[PDB]
Design a protein around this ligand. Structure first.
Ligand code: SAH
Ligand code: SAH
Ligand code: 5UF
Ligand code: 5UF
Lengths: 356, 357
């Protein structure tokens, strides 16, 4: 009965996450800095790094390598470092282990005393032993709600609650996000070693409380309506569609700490809210290729969002009809954005959290 | 890759088709539980690590893991973290594992609130866990799988088991691969275990007389494959290509790395037993006379464990519906053959307890 989002499209995520990779780039610096100074476990005990919301692992390679290189300047070369990559049970962990084995950038190919493991359990519960994680990393994951909130009204535009006209929808989604954030922090608070550090990068609202991706939103809503207009999509199926993604404002991120600055042994050591450079727009300004612009934006939306949309269909998710819906939606969104390229706001928040 | 590897179990059916395996490993659980009573445990915030080498879907791991956890909780505080590290090949269905751990009431996650689960998708013929971190190792029905079809090995004329091959060169090539694999497995477990740690192994064996067993199954499988060629469902070139890289080890093969002084890479054999598991499908048939059920049980067993590796030899994709068709028909053919003449079979196993210095 509890409706959850779908994981990323395993087949395309590694090729369609350049936006995410570019946006998280500043957080890597914070993560490296944290690795330079974090208190370390005693003796030859393995140093554990956790990666919360790994997907295919492609975008984890750079942050993990940065942390590992920093740690190696502090510990013996034979000392074990274990990376625990976490996601939901239905994530494609085979794609992860293939990434870790095949990609030359994989830390397994650069450090002979680094190890990899996977945890397929929602990070809104405790999923690692208490007091074991020296360094935590989570990028582009916590914006995903644990669920479509119980009793929340159907989203008439489907793809983002920030653009909904229903006040009841916004408040339900907002409450779910606050609970999820409290849960995330409580359990990371137990998992981290005393003195441990967790770096979080997530979708944010900007200074003016805006979600961003305005033209994407428009293109996506219109592309969905076109499929019901062309009879390719059923009105009942479209009505069911909702993306459980919530961007948080600065005050939303500070909410669990506000009492006096601490929550379950954790404190915000650093917080930044910024707009990521729109690389797809920048490239378009350089080469003038409109189709490429549309395809890059559409690919980003497909790998991250379309499986969650596809789950609302009457057929199975491994049905030929679902594949056709995915490919058509992508093509339509590509066409709409290519026909009038516009820059987009990509509001992010980076946090460094410390355990006392 | 020119290195040809076996295929993992059929995720869709393994948990329903692994009762033979579960019944066979039962005696090894006693050994595992006993080891759990005394193995050294790591200090400080480190969790106790139990490693499960060759997890598949996780269905058969639940009982052995719980036995160890229960034993550990008689020694240490309830709030001490225990981490179970389930290991398999990268192409194993780890989603099916995590669903098993979440959904099966027998899961240790449902019986012990300070137990944790992780997965490692890297061949256990390399070191896959940090040195000295594993207190307790478990591996059931996994080590009989070769790391590869040996390079330059002749084609197996009967396809499903080298022990039944009439080709001297093929038997030698497979035996050598099995021997180096065993050395590798031991070398890396010897690194992963803490000093004083224990590893319990359960694998396919040759019996007292050097026999592989499953003779009626072997006959049914060979005949069924030939039937698929004869009936135009399988190409001769596809069948020629089929080989199951499974090797059963004799007592002497298992002891080989350790002879004559008893130690290899810091490990020793503390206990070894060679035995034939009770044939439960035969026992059931003797009780109820249901020949169809007999055939289906045996065929499902063969299907979940062996058929993905056979299907890998087909000209179509393994995601192609024709592969699914091949799987289904081979199972029905084997089921019918055995149903028509039910016979008891030998299921030769070896259980080992290995100890690190
Ligand atoms: N409750 C939860 N527990 C664990 N993972 C979750 C989750 N909710 C969403 N995710 C995962 O978060 C990921 C978002 S994609 C982000 C991937 C990568 N960190 C990057 O920066 O590109 C998906 O794999 C999704 O399955
Ligand atoms: N080199 C290797 N590394 C890790 N796992 C392997 C392997 N070769 C085979 N396996 C795994 O061994 C398993 C055999 S099935 C045994 C499952 C379970 N332990 C039980 O007792 O029923 C399969 O999942 C297979 O993928
Ligand atoms: C307006 C719709 C744009 C939403 C874009 C959503 C981006 C995803 O969160 C990225 C991810 O999960 O890796
Ligand atoms: C005659 C061939 C019968 C072989 C039966 C092989 C059984 C598999 O090893 C079981 C498994 O991998 O779990």
């Amino acid at each position: 009965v509890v409706v959850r989002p779908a994981p990323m499209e395993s087949a395309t995520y590694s090729q369609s996450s350049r936006l995410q990779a570019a946006g998280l780039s500043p957080a890597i610096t914070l993560f490296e800095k944290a690795a330079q100074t974090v208190p370390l476990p005693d003796a030859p005990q393995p140093v554990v790094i956790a990666d919360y919301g790994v997907a295919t692992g492609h975008n984890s390679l750079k942050p993990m390598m940065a942390a590992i290189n920093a740690l190696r300047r502090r510990i013996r070369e034979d000392r074990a470092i274990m990376v625990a990559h976490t996601d939901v049970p239905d994530n494609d962990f085979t794609a992860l282990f293939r990434t870790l084995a095949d990609d030359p950038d994989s830390y397994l190919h650069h450090d002979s005393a680094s190890f990899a493991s996977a945890v397929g359990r929602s990070f809104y519960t405790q999923i690692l032993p208490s007091n074991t994680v020296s360094l935590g990393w989570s990028s582009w994951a916590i914006q995903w709600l644990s669920r479509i909130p119980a009793g929340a009204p159907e989203l008439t535009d489907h793809v983002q609650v920030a653009y909904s006209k229903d006040e009841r929808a916004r408040a339900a989604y907002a409450h779910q996000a606050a609970t999820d954030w409290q849960d995330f922090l409580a359990f990371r608070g137990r998992e981290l070693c005393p003195g441990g550090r967790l770096v979080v990068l997530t979708m944010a609202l900007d200074e003016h409380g805006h979600f961003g991706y305005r033209p994407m939103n428009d293109a996506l809503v219109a592309a969905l309506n076109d499929q019901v207009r062309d009879g390719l999509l059923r009105p009942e199926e479209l009505r069911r569609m909702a993306i459980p993604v919530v961007a948080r404002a600065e005050k939303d991120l500070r909410a669990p700490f506000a009492p006096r600055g601490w929550f379950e042994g954790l404190t915000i050591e650093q917080l930044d809210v910024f707009n990521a450079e729109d690389r797809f727009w920048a490239a378009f300004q350089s080469d003038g290729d409109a189709e490429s612009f549309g395809a890059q934006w559409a690919g980003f939306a497909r790998a991250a969002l379309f499986p969650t949309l596809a789950a609302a269909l009457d057929c199975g998710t491994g049905d030929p009809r679902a594949t056709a819906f995915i490919e058509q939606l992508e093509a339509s969104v590509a066409d709409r954005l290519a026909s009038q390229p516009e820059p987009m706001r990509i509001p992010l928040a980076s946090l460094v959290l410390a355990k006392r």
